[PDB]
């Protein structure tokens, strides 16, 4: 086709970027993360027991208020690295950036308070491949492609550093939010937004991923992550202290921290301390969190690094389904 369309995103505290979709007739609105690290659509269900407090606080899809609903009822569980939701499949019309698509999605009936009470978003729109889709449910971008409306089989992510929170372009990219040329890196394989990485360096020292490793480009993740052993080494190099869920440095040390570079497609993608430290103070008596942590992702996807919002804030990212590649450009 000829259409480009966009979804405007909100940036909650540089950690959660979400847009709004409509589901049903008339449209029920949900806040959703657009997640290249997964392939299912879900939102919380009116069938969710209210003993799940996360279903009390989030927007619930009520099938009984939608005239375009089509029951399916197959039960599915989506296991994320951060937690699990379960429920059942339904079909309805989803509106996303003014594109209406008939989509099979999860109605979540089991939604654990940890972590989902910490989600500003209600649900997830998986932007990954059908190969990753639980229940082999056709992902929404595949269904959008099938309509022949988009000028290209691509979508692009801008995540703002100011917390316009962000923008996803369906069918292209937005030159207003990047500059210079795209650097295009081929996927290891179709089915996952994962590329080869050939080094993680602290300063001039390539102390990790020397023999090569994987990098998942995960728009649904807040941080940069790697395996526990990888991240422990990295954090030992930075002089960072491990806590339960994050690593920290004394805030005064934040600006002294070295650059971290990811060797992707023959180039060094470099984050400075400003890109990865939540510099909330300059006090030697406060602790400042790093936007880098351990996520152990089991095979076949992992072990793998994952380049989340921390990375994407700096690097405008085009996801190219036509050519099975990811393009990076400098975000502005
Ligand atoms: C950039 O803005 C969105 C940041 C959301 C970060 N966040 C995650 C989170 O990081 N994820 C899930 C979620 C999308 C459901 C990621 C999304 N990408 C897929 C990964 C994942 O499960 N894997 C395992 C399989 O391989 C790919 C990475 C989980 N869980 C959360 C719970 C409460 C609050 C915030 C949470
Ligand atoms: C749910 O979807 C599957 C796959 O399309 C289909 O075979 C099945 O019959 C559906 N079930 C119901 C109850 O509609």
From Swiss-Prot:
Glycans are attached at residues 2, 72. GO terms for biological process: amyloid-beta metabolic process; angiotensin maturation; cell maturation; cellular response to xenobiotic stimulus; drinking behavior; hormone-mediated signaling pathway; juxtaglomerular apparatus development; kidney development. Interaction with ATP6AP2 results in a 5-fold increased efficiency in angiotensinogen processing. The active site is at residues 35, 218. Its EC number is 3.4.23.15. It comes from the Eukaryota. It is found in: Secreted; Membrane. GO terms for cellular component: apical part of cell; extracellular region; extracellular space; plasma membrane. GO terms for molecular function: aspartic-type endopeptidase activity; insulin-like growth factor receptor binding; peptidase activity; signaling receptor binding. Keywords: Aspartyl protease, Cleavage on pair of basic residues, Disease variant, Disulfide bond, Glycoprotein, Hydrolase, Membrane, Protease, Secreted, Signal, Zymogen. Disulfide bonds join 48-55, 209-213, 251-288. Residues 17-329 form the Peptidase A1 domain. It catalyses: Cleavage of Leu-|-Xaa bond in angiotensinogen to generate angiotensin I. Belongs to the peptidase A1 family. Renin is a highly specific endopeptidase, whose only known function is to generate angiotensin I from angiotensinogen in the plasma, initiating a cascade of reactions that produce an elevation of blood pressure and increased sodium retention by the kidney. Interacts with ATP6AP2. It is linked to Renal tubular dysgenesis: Autosomal recessive severe disorder of renal tubular development characterized by persistent fetal anuria and perinatal death, probably due to pulmonary hypoplasia from early-onset oligohydramnios (the Potter phenotype). This is Renin. The chain holds residues 70 to 406 of 406 of the full protein.
């Amino acid at each position: 086709g000829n259409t480009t369309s966009s979804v405007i995103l909100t940036n909650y505290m540089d950690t959660q970027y979400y847009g709004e979709i409509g589901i049903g007739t008339p449209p029920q609105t949900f806040k959703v993360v657009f997640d290249t690290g997964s392939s299912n659509v879900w939102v919380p269900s009116s069938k969710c027991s209210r003993l799940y407090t996360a279903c009390v606080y989030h927007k619930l899809f009520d099938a009984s208020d939608s005239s375009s609903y089509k029951h399916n009822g197959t039960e599915l569980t989506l296991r994320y690295s951060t937690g699990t939701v379960s429920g059942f499949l339904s079909q309805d019309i989803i509106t996303v950036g003014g594109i209406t698509v008939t989509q099979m999605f999860g109605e979540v009936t089991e939604m654990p308070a940890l972590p989902f009470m910490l989600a500003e978003f209600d649900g997830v729109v998986g932007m990954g491949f059908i190969e990753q889709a639980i229940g082999r449910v056709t992902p929404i971008f595949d269904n959008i492609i099938s309509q022949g409306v988009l000028k290209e089989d691509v979508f692009s992510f801008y995540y703002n550093r100011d917390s316009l929170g962000g923008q996803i372009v369906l069918g292209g990219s937005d030159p207003q939010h990047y500059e210079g040329n795209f650097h295009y890196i081929n996927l290891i394989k179709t089915g996952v937004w994962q590329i080869q990485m050939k080094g993680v360096s602290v300063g001039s020292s390539t102390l990790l991923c020397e023999d090569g490793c994987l990098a998942l480009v995960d728009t649904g993740a807040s941080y940069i992550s790697g395996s526990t052993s990888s991240i422990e080494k990295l954090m030992e190099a930075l002089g960072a202290k491990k806590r339960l869920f994050d690593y920290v440095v004394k805030c005064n040390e934040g600006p002294t921290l070295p650059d971290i570079s990811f060797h992707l497609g023959g180039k060094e993608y470099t984050l400075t301390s400003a890109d990865y430290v939540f510099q909330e103070s300059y006090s030697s008596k406060k602790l400042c969190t790093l936007a880098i942590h351990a996520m152990d992702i089991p095979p076949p996807t992992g072990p793998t690094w994952a380049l989340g919002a921390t990375f994407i804030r700096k690097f405008y990212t085009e996801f190219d389904r036509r050519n099975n590649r990811i393009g990076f450009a400098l975000a502005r």
